[PDB]
């Protein structure tokens, strides 16, 4: 994987654009007369996390699915992984490639960035943001509310750092898998441990995981302040989540309490916010139940002002 | 936040999205565009005495960086990357042409930031006026850290003025400054009343430098390795105290030598001028000299003719 020559074929053509520091890879679907839709993957996911759902969304949207920096065919940038750098790359992407206002939809950390764009993009760039099971608060080191990253997804990111290493400099996949299987963190059960590293992980810069676990990725983007600054309608979907009865760990993206405060803050900013709890859905609904995801996204987007 | 004073160039503001950025414009768009970045604690009008000279030959934009002047104060969001992307947006939304960027001190850091990290084609060239490469980092690759240079002053901005002037203990700041063991404290204003520039300054800037958060995600050795335009480095007064080892000045000879080396190994044009008797803010305290440095160097840039009309 530190070859950066490990890529495979996909169903939609891919194109790259120079944003200045990062060269961003992306795939396009749908017809350009339809409203623009920017799709942001989960951490460890390339644009083609959205490949099964892109055909469905192609019926109604002009779809751009991107590799975020440090993922896929987009530039890996050591020591530069922050929500602000991720977000400003996407501001540049809209300005250089799309050149229209977008609906932005993001899963997990991509949902953090969907909110980031609502608050901090260039004026007019963002019509609305869909935050698909975004770990508001629970992906911070010291959140204003609820479980920290250390008490939720952190243990997996720690193992990415310790065994895969920055830019796959260590690459001990077998040691990662044996450490993951031996971990006493119940949340580890939500992460794949196949016999060989899966394609999405070979495209992933594990310094992402370091930055989340060490609390550097969002040091300059406290979530309570970010959510208070959003400027567009927001849709929050909230998928599976439980509190482990033996460790107290959060299993899922964010707890009910965290979701309640996220809504409250957005509402206090005076922007439209809608919340949908889908407690039996998997974290990556856009991948594992694309028809349900597409319906949610399409139906909501139809309620947006023109 | 209503302590502003008049100035001899009209000021305007532009919404960048998060930051509303204040700036002063002078000159004709027929001449090359020039973006002026102040030092930390300096508003755009740090350049007000020299802009008349520069407006003879340049279309000048002098800006208030986020957390300074009339530009939005943004609690907890002070980083070189956020400062830098604001300026990327400013060029894209206001200037709409390639620019020469000239910055003093932290503004010089940001000029190099733009050279490396702006959108393609935005930056023609960067003038880094006594920029504290390495010396303004918490863990620099080379030489003094901020803790052995300007840090003690920023520490006192944090401790006595506070984030967004939330403490505001100017008297106690002055008293602590005078009592400081740091020889470098003599380089900072300690008047009996807070000066105008500092009333316009968000001291969380100082916190961010002292605590090593402002450039956590922008190590300077890597930044300098990624520059993509010609760079002019001016290096003004500096000495290293023989008793404490403190750096008095923006950067040491060792730090300037590595900065040059790194830029040159990026394969771009780099020029270095040592002005060991110049004050840190030469653009303010020796404006005629500074204007001649910038103008004469700009005239040697490729496409200087294309940018005249
Ligand atoms: C890798 C991606 C895969 C999801 C693995 C899980 O289903 C665990 C529960 C959901 C939380 C994930 C999660 C937390 C976080 O604090 C930061 C992140 O980027 C994610 C994030 O993107 N996970
Ligand atoms: C306040 C402004 C003016 C104070 C200048 C001095 O006379 C001290 C000399 C060294 C440079 C300061 C300096 C260091 C740094 O690590 C980061 C910075 O932004 C400055 C910076 O902009 N100083």
Author numbering:
A (entry chain B): 21 to 326
B (entry chain A): 24 to 332
Copy the relevant paper text.
As inactivation of ZenAScfl by substituting the catalytic His-286 with tyrosine (H286Y) caused conformational changes at the active site, we attempted to get structural information with a bound, noncleavable substrate analogue. A derivative of ZEN, which is a cyclic amide rather than a cyclic carboxylic ester, was synthesized. In line with proposed nomenclature guidelines, we called the molecule zearalactamenone (ZLAEN). The ligand was found at the active site of ZenARe, and the resorcylic acid moiety was in the same position as the one of HZEN in ZenAScfl H286Y. Most of the structure of ZenARe remained unchanged upon binding of ZLAEN. However, the positions of the amino acids Met-208 – Pro-214 at the lip of the cap were shifted upon binding. The biggest movements were observed for Leu-210, where Cα was shifted by 4.4 Å and CD by 6.7 Å, and Phe-211, where the Cα was shifted by 3.1 Å, and side-chain atoms were shifted by up to 5.8 Å. The nucleophilic Ser-112 appeared in the same orientation as in the unbound structure, forming a hydrogen bond with N21 of ZLAEN at a distance of 3.5 Å. The side-chain amide of Gln-63 formed a hydrogen bond of 2.8 Å with the hydroxyl group connected to C-16 of ZLAEN. However, crystal structure analysis revealed that only ZenARe underwent a structural change resembling enzyme closure, with residues in the cap’s lip adopting a more closed conformation of the ZEN-binding pocket.
